[PDB]
Enzyme design. Structure first.
Site, mmCIF file in Angstrom:
data_model
loop_
_atom_site.group_PDB
_atom_site.id
_atom_site.type_symbol
_atom_site.label_atom_id
_atom_site.label_comp_id
_atom_site.label_asym_id
_atom_site.label_seq_id
_atom_site.Cartn_x
_atom_site.Cartn_y
_atom_site.Cartn_z
ATOM 1 N N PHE A 93 0.856 -1.169 0.000
ATOM 2 C CA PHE A 93 0.000 0.000 0.000
ATOM 3 C C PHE A 93 0.906 1.236 0.000
ATOM 4 O O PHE A 93 1.909 1.267 0.715
ATOM 5 C CB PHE A 93 -0.861 -0.023 1.256
ATOM 6 C CG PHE A 93 -1.896 1.055 1.315
ATOM 7 C CD1 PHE A 93 -3.109 0.912 0.638
ATOM 8 C CD2 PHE A 93 -1.683 2.190 2.095
ATOM 9 C CE1 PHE A 93 -4.100 1.886 0.746
ATOM 10 C CE2 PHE A 93 -2.662 3.175 2.219
ATOM 11 C CZ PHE A 93 -3.878 3.026 1.544
ATOM 12 N N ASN A 190 -3.246 2.373 10.613
ATOM 13 C CA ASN A 190 -4.048 2.891 9.513
ATOM 14 C C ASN A 190 -4.447 1.572 8.862
ATOM 15 O O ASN A 190 -3.821 1.112 7.908
ATOM 16 C CB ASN A 190 -3.237 3.733 8.533
ATOM 17 C CG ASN A 190 -4.028 4.062 7.282
ATOM 18 O OD1 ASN A 190 -5.259 4.096 7.317
ATOM 19 N ND2 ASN A 190 -3.332 4.310 6.175
ATOM 20 N N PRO A 191 -5.490 0.936 9.396
ATOM 21 C CA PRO A 191 -6.002 -0.345 8.918
ATOM 22 C C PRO A 191 -6.892 -0.255 7.703
ATOM 23 O O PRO A 191 -7.233 0.831 7.237
ATOM 24 C CB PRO A 191 -6.775 -0.843 10.119
ATOM 25 C CG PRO A 191 -7.471 0.427 10.541
ATOM 26 C CD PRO A 191 -6.356 1.466 10.466
HETATM 27 C C1 LIG Z 1 -3.929 0.848 4.518
HETATM 28 S S1 LIG Z 1 -2.641 -0.400 4.591
HETATM 29 C C2 LIG Z 1 -1.325 0.350 5.560
HETATM 30 C C3 LIG Z 1 -0.520 1.386 4.946
HETATM 31 C C4 LIG Z 1 0.491 1.952 5.909
HETATM 32 N N1 LIG Z 1 0.174 1.556 7.316
HETATM 33 C C5 LIG Z 1 0.363 3.427 5.772
HETATM 34 O O1 LIG Z 1 -0.001 4.088 6.757
HETATM 35 O O2 LIG Z 1 0.637 3.864 4.604
HETATM 36 C C6 LIG Z 1 -3.210 -1.588 5.737
HETATM 37 C C7 LIG Z 1 -2.237 -2.744 5.953
HETATM 38 O O3 LIG Z 1 -2.818 -3.580 6.930
HETATM 39 C C8 LIG Z 1 -2.412 -4.905 6.730
HETATM 40 N N2 LIG Z 1 -3.395 -5.668 7.456
HETATM 41 C C9 LIG Z 1 -4.694 -5.979 7.149
HETATM 42 N N3 LIG Z 1 -5.304 -6.664 8.087
HETATM 43 C C10 LIG Z 1 -4.331 -6.808 9.076
HETATM 44 C C11 LIG Z 1 -4.330 -7.432 10.366
HETATM 45 N N4 LIG Z 1 -5.428 -8.048 10.876
HETATM 46 N N5 LIG Z 1 -3.172 -7.402 11.126
HETATM 47 C C12 LIG Z 1 -2.087 -6.783 10.618
HETATM 48 N N6 LIG Z 1 -1.979 -6.159 9.426
HETATM 49 C C13 LIG Z 1 -3.150 -6.209 8.695
HETATM 50 C C14 LIG Z 1 -2.308 -5.082 5.199
HETATM 51 O O4 LIG Z 1 -1.462 -6.104 4.739
HETATM 52 C C15 LIG Z 1 -2.101 -3.650 4.733
HETATM 53 O O5 LIG Z 1 -0.683 -3.494 4.422
HETATM 54 N N1 LIG Z 2 -6.828 2.683 5.536
HETATM 55 C C1 LIG Z 2 -7.485 2.329 4.429
HETATM 56 O O1 LIG Z 2 -8.667 1.965 4.438
HETATM 57 C C2 LIG Z 2 -6.696 2.382 3.129
HETATM 58 C C3 LIG Z 2 -7.247 3.386 2.104
HETATM 59 C C4 LIG Z 2 -7.209 4.855 2.546
HETATM 60 N N2 LIG Z 2 -8.429 5.179 3.341
HETATM 61 C C5 LIG Z 2 -7.088 5.773 1.319
HETATM 62 O O2 LIG Z 2 -7.974 5.706 0.437
HETATM 63 O O3 LIG Z 2 -6.111 6.555 1.252
#
Ligand SMILES: C[S@@+](CC[C@H](N)C(=O)[O-])C[C@H]1O[C@@H](n2cnc3c(N)ncnc32)[C@H](O)[C@@H]1O
Ligand SMILES: NC(=O)CC[C@H](N)C(=O)O
Ligand SMILES: C[S@@+](CC[C@H](N)C(=O)[O-])C[C@H]1O[C@@H](n2cnc3c(N)ncnc32)[C@H](O)[C@@H]1O
Ligand SMILES: NC(=O)CC[C@H](N)C(=O)O
Lengths: 274, 274
Positions: A93, A190-191
């Site tokens: 991401f 940031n899930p």
């Molecule tokens: C929106 S992305 C994070 C981007 C990054 N944290 C940022 O702030 O740019 C969410 C991440 O959560 C991870 N993820 C999803 N479900 C999860 C869980 N239950 N435990 C840990 N990581 C999880 C995914 O693999 C994904 O990379």
């Molecule tokens: N945290 C998330 O749900 C990932 C997508 C994020 N809300 C975005 O569109 O930038």
């Protein structure tokens, strides 16, 4: 001004090919062009800066690629976040501008309470965790279900000299760090909080789906996390979706909600550090 | 007939969205569907195969992605080559059909002169090398200038139980194995042989450019290889462009040029095993 034209004429043509895909078409083109010429943005102004027919074709090819919706930052291989260069690639991401505001709040809170141990669930590229370790003295325990995110977050931590204070393990929530749970003072994240039914824009179509969807609600991560862990004595700061405040209040009590610089609700803050 | 109407109607709509991007429109949709459902292609008929609204949406999104020109095998994460399933992803060239014929001829010469040591230059995902190790007793020394290719080649090696006979290292040509040079009885390779001026089809646009281009001429790899290595007592089998035979004769003499199953010239064979 022989070479002065040509490159700028090219810049404009490409810019035109990208509108309809991005409001910042000119910027993107400048970025793609400096990347292919192997120069920093600033040097785009150098007099007699040339573009061979090969570099020109390469630029047109990358512009044609970006025109399909493919992420600009996957093309660049990096994204600037908090002033740091985070490596990114397919399967990871790409850090978002709103998440920078979450980190700045986290840092203010770390300063304020002299926090020493932080957690970053769903670290992705390492944006939140690595930055926190970079601008504070806290140690960070990060996790991700994605093997690819873990390897990339490691590289990014090493890239900014914080491998000694940033540890990442594959797995969900904080399961990989059970032995450290009690010791963690602040949990950041940031899930994925997008609804299963939400329409994906062309570019996010290329990002990991596990990084986006949070079930019918787009709240599955919050429900399971708050349902499984005891936030006693800790501080929890997480990014959320614009319209999830009311529903979130029913998942976790005594929570505060802060908004963007764009005026939209973007962060939930739970302070149980009595 | 009721549940069959759902899935088969979806498959038809999807195919419609992919025409103009591929002629094997319905085959691809079938591959994409069986992937998000987690089943083999052979089970697409089965009894009552259902598609949740979540799996439906995911299928439409992956078809929307393929519609952009994004490689089908990058979406699938694998490519069948020589009956073996090879993992592939962005940063790695997707094995091509023609290259299978090169391998068959390779196994031919190995099970003739009883060859025991083979090299695979620019192994990419490892298709050539790994397949040779899997269908013969020879060991293989693979190389590639792509760090990403090296790791994937290695994974595919373990994936097929040949980590003990397939050794890959980063670097160009055979430099990373210079000390084994005399040991190698056969040198195999499918190098980049596309003219830097050639038009790139929409999906090739997403593959590593280092895997495609060989200069203005398209023959750079060949020129450098033959002008740097003495091929005495060795067999060299490599894939080439269909319009390069005549110019290649001027780069390496006493070479034989074989054709495709499609009637195109695809291989060059220099046998100096005296
Ligand atoms: C929106 S992305 C994070 C981007 C990054 N944290 C940022 O702030 O740019 C969410 C991440 O959560 C991870 N993820 C999803 N479900 C999860 C869980 N239950 N435990 C840990 N990581 C999880 C995914 O693999 C994904 O990379
Ligand atoms: N945290 C998330 O749900 C990932 C997508 C994020 N809300 C975005 O569109 O930038
Ligand atoms: C067309 S792809 C090979 C595809 C084939 N299916 C395979 O498995 O090898 C060519 C590979 O050569 C590598 N390559 C390019 N120039 C090279 C060089 N000078 N020495 C070694 N490898 C090189 C690339 O990184 C690329 O993966
Ligand atoms: N090794 C090669 O350069 C073969 C690639 C092939 N000509 C393609 O563009 O699909």
């Amino acid at each position: 001004s022989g070479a002065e034209r040509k490159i700028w004429s090219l810049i404009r043509d490409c810019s035109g090919k990208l509108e309809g895909v991005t409001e910042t078409s000119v910027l993107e083109v400048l970025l793609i062009v400096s990347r292919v010429l192997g120069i920093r943005k600033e040097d785009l102004f150098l007099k007699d800066l040339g573009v061979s027919p090969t570099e020109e074709k390469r630029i047109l090819e990358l512009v044609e690629k970006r025109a399909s919706g493919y992420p600009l930052h996957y093309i660049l291989g990096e994204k600037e976040f908090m002033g740091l260069s985070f490596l990114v690639e397919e399967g990871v991401f790409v850090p978002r501008p709103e998440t920078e505001e979450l980190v700045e709040l986290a840092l203010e809170l770390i300063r304020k309470y002299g926090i020493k141990t932080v957690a970053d669930i769903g670290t992705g590229s390492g944006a939140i965790g690595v930055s926190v370790a970079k601008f504070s003295d806290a140690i960070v325990f990060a996790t991700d279900v994605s093997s690819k995110a873990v390897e990339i977050a490691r590289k990014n931590a090493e890239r900014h000299g914080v491998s000694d204070r940033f540890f990442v393990r594959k797995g969900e929530f904080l399961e990989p760090f059970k032995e450290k749970f009690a010791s963690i003072e602040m949990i950041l994240s940031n899930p994925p909080y997008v609804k299963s039914s939400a329409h994906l824009p062309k570019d996010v179509l290329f990002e990991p789906p596990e990084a986006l969807f949070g079930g019918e609600d787009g709240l599955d991560f919050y429900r399971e996390f708050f349902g499984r862990y005891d936030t006693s004595g800790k501080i929890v700061l997480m990014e959320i979706g614009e319209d999830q405040v009311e529903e979130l209040k029913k998942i976790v009590s005594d929570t505060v909600f802060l908004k963007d610089s764009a005026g939209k609700y973007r962060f939930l803050l739970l302070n149980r550090r009595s």
